[PDB]
């Protein structure tokens with residue numbers, strides 16, 4: 001019922017001091033795991049208000065296979081601007097690898113479509129995998145992939161997804177990542193004719209930045225509310241979902257906490 | 261602490277029955293954690309064939325696509341898949357040592373990782389991937405231990421493996437010992453102590469034809485782990501089988517992989 005907050009508390013109390021690329025100190029643990037039963041509720045956080053619009057649009061953008069911020073801008077989303085070129089380009093980041101992993105043949109692999117196929121025709125496959133960690137291409141990316149690699153699993157007509165995320169800004173970043181992949185899992189399940197199972201979040205370096213400590217204590221003092229419910233309009237292709245096809249119902253968070 | 265045996269028990273009791281030719285019990289997203297300071301996680305509840313483990317890893321480090329070097333040393337675990345020339349495709353070690361970049365250049369992920377460990381231990385990008393989406397079809401089969409990350413805190417090197425598919429009875433004992441061993445080498449080459457080895461799996465399964473063997477293993481009292489000693493070397497690529505001594509290994513009898 002509070003996998004994120006449990007993890008957040010554990011790292012707060014138990015994390016090891018560790019210097020960071022950004023010059024801010026962190027407390028961190030390595031190899032941590034959160035598990036959500038999606039059937040019980042949609043894990044958009046209630047102990048602090050999370051901006052779902054940013055989440056949903058970024059995901060739709062990924063599913064386009066889009067390396068340009070343009071389409072995000074058409075929709076008022078600016079979360080990627082900082083890193084873009086004067087043309088708006090970011091290099092072959094997430095979505096580009098999801099939809100268009102360049103194969104030696106000179107062709108391209110749509111990992112999203114490949115996975116949906118497997119889920120429909122061979123649900124017991126243990127190879128239903130999407131990777132964004134394209135070693136040869138990472139240098140051309142504005143940023144190395146963070147949520148790097150994910151797998152699907154099917155049991156009893158329920159779809160599960162496990163994400164491997166190599167680095168996790170537990171306070172500022174992870175709440176978006178959880179919501180994003182949960183959303184992805186609903187979209188995949190709907191398109192594969194399955195229901196939702198578990199979302200499993202597995203992290204590499206899980207850290208609380210030193211300048212978020214007070215914000216974390218605030219958030220940990222709050223009693224979680226019941227989770228909202230996720231609803232999707234009917235579509236016959238994952239690539240046809242729009243922002244308007246998604247509804248987050250009964251989302252009742254505590255107030256947003258702004259970070260320094 | 262016996263994370264392996266715990267996991268085995270857990271999957272045996274709560275696993276979902278499934279298909280694939282043999283059926284399995286399956287759980288998804290299971291994690292195991294070993295403090296390498298406390299001992300080398302070479303299983304004591306059955307004799308684990310470490311010879312095959314150690315040689316396989318050394319073979320990986322070589323970047324070798326062909327099984328020749330493994331026969332040279334008596335190891336037959338990869339036979340069932342080789343071509344008549346004994347090639348396997350760009351499996352594990354090819355990806356570790358020479359991931360083909362679009363530039364025509366090859367990336368040595370091992371050296372890159374070692375270099376970060378020496379140069380920038382705080383890095384959260386210290387990763388080796390075998391999951392080369394474009395090359396998987398050329399491989400005799402797709403990678404199981406698909407990729408791994410290193411992490412340093414307080415001079416201690418931890419490693420995390422992501423393994424998409426896990427034969428809990430036959431495969432996982434090797435995967436643990438192999439990545440445990442690789443962490444010791446990396447730590448030594450980097451001037452670090454050993455921290456934790458974290459095993460994270462995808463489809464974690466016991467084959468239906470392994471249940472009796474699994475029960476035998478679980479009735480056995482676990483014994484203290486052995487200790488691993490690595491002779492000195494100047495480079496991770498120069499280690500040899502003889503550099504690797506597992507002291508004080510006192511396992512219960514091996515358990516034959518059924519037919």
Ligand SMILES: O=c1ccn([C@H]2C[C@H](O)[C@@H](COP(=O)(O)O)O2)c(=O)[nH]1
Pocket residue numbers: 021144146147167168169170172173174177384385
């Ligand atoms: O989807 C993301 C992307 C980034 N980060 C955080 C983790 C790190 O704190 C930082 C990126 O820093 P590096 O690990 O690359 O150094 O951003 C996330 O938490 N989730």
Ligand SMILES: O=c1ccn([C@H]2C[C@H](O)[C@@H](COP(=O)(O)O)O2)c(=O)[nH]1
Pocket residue numbers: 126127401402404405425426427428430431432435
């Ligand atoms: O290092 C390895 C390699 C393979 N396997 C197992 C997992 C599966 O049972 C089988 C590979 O089959 P697929 O998941 O590819 O179907 O081998 C392991 O457990 N460890």
